[PDB]
């Protein structure tokens, strides 16, 4: 499995 970035507004 590959780690995803966290989501934030305007990314």
């Amino acid at each position, epitope marked *: *499995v*590959e*780690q*995803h*970035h*966290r*989501r*934030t*507004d*305007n*990314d």
Partner: antibody, heavy 123, light 116 residues
Framework: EVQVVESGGGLVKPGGSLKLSCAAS????????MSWVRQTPEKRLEWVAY????????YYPDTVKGRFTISRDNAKNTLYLQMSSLKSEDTAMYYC????????????????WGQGTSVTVSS | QLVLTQSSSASFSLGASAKLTCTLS???????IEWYQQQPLKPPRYVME???????STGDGIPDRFSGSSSGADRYLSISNIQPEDEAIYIC?????????????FGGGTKVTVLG
């Protein structure tokens, strides 16, 4: 200096509810995503809510989903956690934590934590 | 699932070089993790973010004595010249977003004693 100051902890009966605040100062609060993490009396840390810098993303783990609501007011540099249908096992120290500036890492690190506010749910 | 495994306790002689191990679940063996330090009567303090290649970035006010490395699913926190103020619980932490659900997992923590 960077400050995050939690308040609102206290004793509540099971089934009750409580609202925590976190006042931030010393950094540009509306640039940062924020979380609440709790720590049990046996010292185990558990992540309980996340909110993004502009409030578009909020997430909760299954253990609190449907009972806890995270929110923020950028105009007042304040983060909140509304808790309801409280259970005895929600007894814990509650910390407000800042995620590392997204320009520094797009991952998960919590780079500053408050002193915590204590919550006891008990009959 | 996503799991962090760490010993519950370690002791090292004052002045010694210490190394702590955090291990990722096999299917997450390439993840970027963080280390936190919790000293008695204080909140957790961010120590560093640590990548699968061993490169790392340490938090504000962390001595040069702390450093990180990696080996497969293992993540290490090394402390040269261990001092009495390094007595603490060390906890690793790791995040992910899976099917648009954010998750964040903590290790059980390693309680560290400085002997001597």
């Amino acid at each position: 200096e960077v400050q995050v100051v939690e308040s609102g902890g206290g004793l509540v009966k099971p089934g009750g509810s409580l609202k925590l605040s976190c006042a931030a100062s010393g950094f540009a609060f509306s640039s940062y995503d924020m979380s609440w993490v709790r720590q049990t009396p046996e010292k185990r840390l558990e992540w309980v809510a996340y909110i993004s810098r502009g409030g578009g993303y909020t997430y909760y783990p299954d253990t609190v989903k449907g009972r806890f609501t995270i929110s923020r007011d950028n105009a007042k540099n304040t983060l909140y956690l509304q808790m309801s249908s409280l259970k005895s096992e929600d007894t814990a120290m509650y910390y407000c934590s800042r995620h590392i500036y997204y320009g520094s890492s797009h991952y998960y690190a919590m780079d500053y934590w408050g002193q915590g506010t204590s919550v006891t749910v008990s009959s | 699932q996503l799991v962090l495994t760490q010993s519950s306790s370690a002791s090292f002689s004052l002045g010694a070089s210490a190394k702590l191990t955090c291990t990722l679940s096999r299917q997450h063996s390439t993840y970027t993790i963080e280390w936190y330090q919790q000293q008695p009567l204080k909140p957790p303090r961010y120590v560093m973010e640590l990548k699968k290649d061993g490169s790392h970035s340490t938090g504000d006010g962390i001595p040069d004595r702390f450093s990180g490395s990696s080996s497969g699913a293992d993540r290490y926190l090394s402390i040269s010249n261990i001092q009495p103020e390094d007595e603490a619980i060390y906890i690793c932490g790791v995040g992910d977003t899976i099917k648009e659900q954010f998750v964040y997992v903590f290790g059980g923590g390693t309680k560290v004693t400085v002997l001597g």
